[PDB]
Design a binder for this molecule. Structure first.
Ligand SMILES: CCCCCCCCCCCCCC(=O)O[C@@H](CO)COC(=O)CCCCCCCC
Ligand SMILES: CCCCCCCCCCCCCC(=O)O[C@@H](CO)COC(=O)CCCCCCCC
Ligand SMILES: CCCCCCCCCCCCCC(=O)O[C@@H](CO)COC(=O)CCCCCCCC
Ligand SMILES: CCCCCCCCCCCCCC(=O)O[C@@H](CO)COC(=O)CCCCCCCC
Ligand SMILES: CCCCCCCCCO
Ligand SMILES: CCCCCCCCCO
Ligand SMILES: CCCCCCCCCO
Ligand SMILES: CCCCCCCCCO
Ligand SMILES: [K+]
Ligand SMILES: [K+]
Ligand SMILES: [K+]
Ligand SMILES: [K+]
Ligand SMILES: [K+]
Ligand SMILES: [K+]
Lengths: 106, 103, 103, 103, 103, 106
């Protein structure tokens, strides 16, 4: 099964800086990685699909990059409402799996 | 119309149906098998086309019994289609050569 | 019945026999070669079908001399079968076009 | 000249055009997709040939929607070409056998 | 003998020659390219056969310009051979159906 | 040849807990892994075939998971009669090979 490693588990940034979340797959999975945001007591929300594709309604300061085993979710200039947990999820092989999450702290 | 052209068009229609149905059924068969990659519909449709044409890059392939049975139906539909079209072409060329030589 | 249909049916029967015999013989040839994957019968039968149809995903392939000779017989049986069927189809279409035009 | 030979030559010309145009368009479609390998023209031309002949080693394959659509046009041009040539060959052989038997 | 059978046998002979010559030339073209695997004759002969039949597992493939040109000649010899045989089969079936119906 | 690593070699559990045996293959072998139980002075007994498929006569508290290189045999709520050595075996490539075994201790 595809193991997804998100490290580090906690990211500490200053307001308005660029932040990057890492997600590493235990084997090559093309661009089949999707990124979700979960705020406190909220349900997950899709941010980026297929490693880099935008979702309507998501602010444009979110972007994603990478292919193969190494994936990055990026926030241009973080702000308070970005405080949340961030999960990656692969859909290359069955079963779908999730990474363990990175918390954003400001 | 002539039978060979009706048969070729029929076969093209049936082939399109086999590609779509096979894509749906491949995903249905392969989800639940750990390691399977034929598990989302867009790339399953692509796989069904490169299987029907007998190209088979190997970027995707089924691992279950039912996914492989579906693959076999897709291969045979593709090869039969291509055979039907070749035969219809031959029939057209043979008849036009008969006429051109005066029967 | 007509010769082209008898030949096509014969070829389909022989092809099924070649697929089963080739699966058995592929496992027999490949066991004993370190690294070989064509070594259990269900997936060997699948390999023989995708070889006969000339799809060749490459998920499985023989590495020994005898396993590759078996593969060649399977390829040729599959290509010959498909050629026989195309030719039988052509013969049917040509004869029906002869009749439809009044000979 | 006879229609089947004109059609075969036409199809060979069109196939060459499809191979070159498909190589150009494959690179155009695939650049910009992370991970894509069909992104320089010499190896894209090689890929288009092994796709048209339905060999499909799998050393290269498209990953985008448009690169895969181009692949489908290339497959169909190659299979149609080969069908056209087989049918032209059949037409030639049938006519020469008609003459050899005295019509 | 009849032309279609002479042409088919000729094509089978030429195909065998193309397989052997292509195996020799593939090794000659590919040695000297770092990473190339088509570099010893037994497995090059196997590669040439699975290329001629258009199976293309992808266990082996050429990387140089000349090795790929050789591959193209092998593909075309294999596809042409198979087309020639299909056409010869069609010609045989058409003539026997003519006789069986009384011309 | 496929090397199968079973680690740890000894697993110590409490009655009724869930236990997991690890088996790692030196290269990817799909789901071609089979699991055997061997009690003291007994012959091996097939528990799970093709990574996750049940065998008739085997209690349902046994299950297996994984694909690729990483495989897990699981026992829901272990009991005394599960005390035994546990072996994985691959059939993806010739020759078939065995892992070195994990002993269950309660
Ligand atoms: C029950 C549903 C079965 C039908 C599934 C619908 C598929 C939708 C395709 C269009 C959406 C694009 C999404 C995407 O990113 O697609 C490409 C990868 O980027 C995948 O390439 C492909 O979808 C391959 C296309 C093959 C063309 C086949 C033509 C047959 C003559
Ligand atoms: C001497 C013996 C030769 C015959 C071998 C018997 C094979 C038995 C197959 C059914 C058992 C299922 C086990 C299993 O899990 O099978 C699939 C993988 O899950 C493998 O897929 C396959 O077996 C591929 C099937 C190919 C269909 C070929 C049809 C030809 C027109
Ligand atoms: C818009 C441009 C489309 C045309 C692209 C031009 C390609 C130029 C090829 C010659 C330059 C050699 C560079 C090189 O190192 O090439 C080989 C690898 O070493 C790659 O093998 C190939 O180029 C494969 C050749 C396939 C032959 C196809 C014949 C069709 C019947
Ligand atoms: C200029 C020389 C060109 C001819 C090369 C001579 C090749 C000799 C083959 C026999 C020696 C066995 C060594 C060996 O271990 O061979 C197999 C791997 O174990 C490889 O499988 C193969 O050689 C594949 C055989 C393909 C059969 C092709 C039949 C065509 C209808
Ligand atoms: C080959 C046509 C029948 C395919 C049925 C697939 C259903 C899969 C269920 O697991
Ligand atoms: C090609 C038909 C003969 C195959 C015989 C296979 C026997 C393998 C023994 O090692
Ligand atoms: C299938 C013929 C049309 C291909 C057009 C490719 C253009 C790619 C643009 O992203
Ligand atoms: C395609 C026929 C000619 C092949 C010549 C190969 C010679 C390779 C020299 O590097
Ligand atoms: K192929
Ligand atoms: K093929
Ligand atoms: K292939
Ligand atoms: K392949
Ligand atoms: K590969
Ligand atoms: K063909």
């Amino acid at each position: 099964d595809i193991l997804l490693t998100q490290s580090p588990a906690i990211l500490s940034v200053s307001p308005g800086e660029r932040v990057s979340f890492s997600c590493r797959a235990s084997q090559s999975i093309g661009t089949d990685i999707h990124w979700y945001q979960q705020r406190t007591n909220g349900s997950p929300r899709l941010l980026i699909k297929y490693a880099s594709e935008s979702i309507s309604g998501i602010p444009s300061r979110f972007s994603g990059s990478g292919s193969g085993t190494d994936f990055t979710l990026s926030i241009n200039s973080v702000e308070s409402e970005d405080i949340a947990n961030y999960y990656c999820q692969q859909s290359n092989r069955w079963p779908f799996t999730f990474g363990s999450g990175t918390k954003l702290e400001i | 119309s002539a039978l060979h052209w009706r048969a070729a068009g029929a076969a093209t229609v049936l082939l399109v149906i086999v590609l779509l149905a096979g894509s749906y059924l491949a995903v249905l068969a392969e989800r639940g098998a750990p390691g399977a990659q034929l598990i989302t519909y867009p790339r399953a449709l692509w796989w069904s086309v490169e299987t029907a044409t007998t190209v088979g890059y190997g970027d995707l392939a089924p691992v279950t019994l039912w996914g492989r049975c579906v693959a076999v139906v897709v291969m045979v539909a593709g090869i039969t289609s291509a055979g039907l079209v070749t035969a219809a072409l031959a029939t057209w060329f043979v008849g036009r050569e008969q006429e051109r030589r005066g029967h």
